[PDB]
Amino acid sequence: ASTNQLQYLQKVVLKDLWKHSFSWPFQRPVDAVKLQLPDYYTIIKNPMDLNTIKKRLENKYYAKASECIEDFNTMFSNCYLYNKPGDDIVLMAQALEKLFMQKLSQ
Amino acid sequence: TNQLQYLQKVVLKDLWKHSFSWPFQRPVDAVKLQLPDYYTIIKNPMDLNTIKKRLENKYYAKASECIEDFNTMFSNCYLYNKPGDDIVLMAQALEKLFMQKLSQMPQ
């Protein structure tokens, strides 16, 4: 049905994004204090990192993989909204977004 | 004369659009990246935007001056960093290209 797609995202995509050289600013929750950003959690109403995907797949929380992609994009869009064009964090995102989009197989 | 156009329209054009070229296009902010003693080690920092402006502003008198500015950039990175640091596998993969696109240069 629509659930063969859903473990593709777990066993292929998420695990291919995790071992990417750029995925470490997005692995865990943004530590707003140690990064001198005292607004990230007042600005971002939907904080999303990679470890939280991992667990909603482990937890089988996503019904219909549509719901799951939405969060992958939320993680890149969270980035683009907060930051600005050119920032190094943004070009790291624009290249993860690129590999993620390349995994349009099943 | 002739060659300086080539470095604009071929070498720099192709290097700029590579997947790895972006950490070399603008000055490194070692304050933020937390790189100790960066601009103390690197006497002469180099970015690709500077090679862009120098070719647009026609400051180079000879392609030699330009080619060294490229190598200054690569070598600058090899000095500060380890071999095997991801930034260096990037830098190396570029010089491999830089050298290919140079072996097809006119006279």
Swiss-Prot record, chain A:
Subcellular location: Nucleus
Residues the record lists as binding JQ1: N83
Tissue-wise expression: Testis-specific. A 3-fold higher expression is seen in adult testis than in embryo testis. Expression seems to be correlated with histone H4 hyperacetylation during the haploid phase of spermatogenesis (spermiogenesis). No expression, or very low expression is seen in patients' testes with abnormal spermatogenesis. Expressed in cancers such as non-small cell lung cancer and squamous cell carcinomas of the head and neck as well as of esophagus, but not in melanoma or in cancers of the colon, breast, kidney and bladder.
Signal sequence, start to end: none
Domain Bromo: 3-106
Post-translational modification: Ubiquitinated in a SPOP-dependent manner, leading to proteasomal degradation.
Swiss-Prot/TrEMBL site (Histone H4K5ac binding) positions: N83, D88
Record comment regarding domains: Bromo domains mediate interaction with histones that have acetylated lysine residues at specific positions. Bromo domain 1 mediates binding with histone H4 acetylated at 'Lys-5' and 'Lys-8' (H4K5ac and H4K8ac, respectively). The bromo domains also recognize and bind a subset of butyrylated histones: able to bind histone H4 butyrylated at 'Lys-8' (H4K8ac), while it is not able to bind H4 butyrylated at 'Lys-5' (H4K5ac).
Function according to Swiss-Prot or TrEMBL: Testis-specific chromatin protein that specifically binds histone H4 acetylated at 'Lys-5' and 'Lys-8' (H4K5ac and H4K8ac, respectively) and plays a key role in spermatogenesis. Required in late pachytene spermatocytes: plays a role in meiotic and post-meiotic cells by binding to acetylated histones at the promoter of specific meiotic and post-meiotic genes, facilitating their activation at the appropriate time. In the post-meiotic phase of spermatogenesis, binds to hyperacetylated histones and participates in their general removal from DNA.
Subunit structure, interactors included: Interacts with mRNA splicing machinery proteins SRSF2, DDX5, HNRNPK and TARDBP. Interacts with the acetylated N-terminus of histone H1, H2, H3 and H4. Interacts with P-TEFb components CDK9 and CCNT1/cyclin-T1. Interacts with SMARCE1. Interacts with the acetylated N-terminus of histone H1.4, H2A, H2B, H3 and H4.
Miscellaneous: BRDT is a promising target for male contraception. Inhibition by thienodiazepine inhibitor (+)-JQ1 that binds Asn-83, prevents recognition of acetylated histone H4, causing a complete and reversible contraceptive effect in male mice.
UniProt disease annotation: Spermatogenic failure 21: An infertility disorder caused by spermatogenesis defects and characterized by acephalic spermatozoa in the semen of affected individuals. SPGF21 inheritance is autosomal recessive.
Family: Belongs to the BET family.
Protein's recorded name: Bromodomain testis-specific protein
Species whose genome carries this gene: Homo sapiens
Portion of the full-length sequence here: 29 to 132 of 947
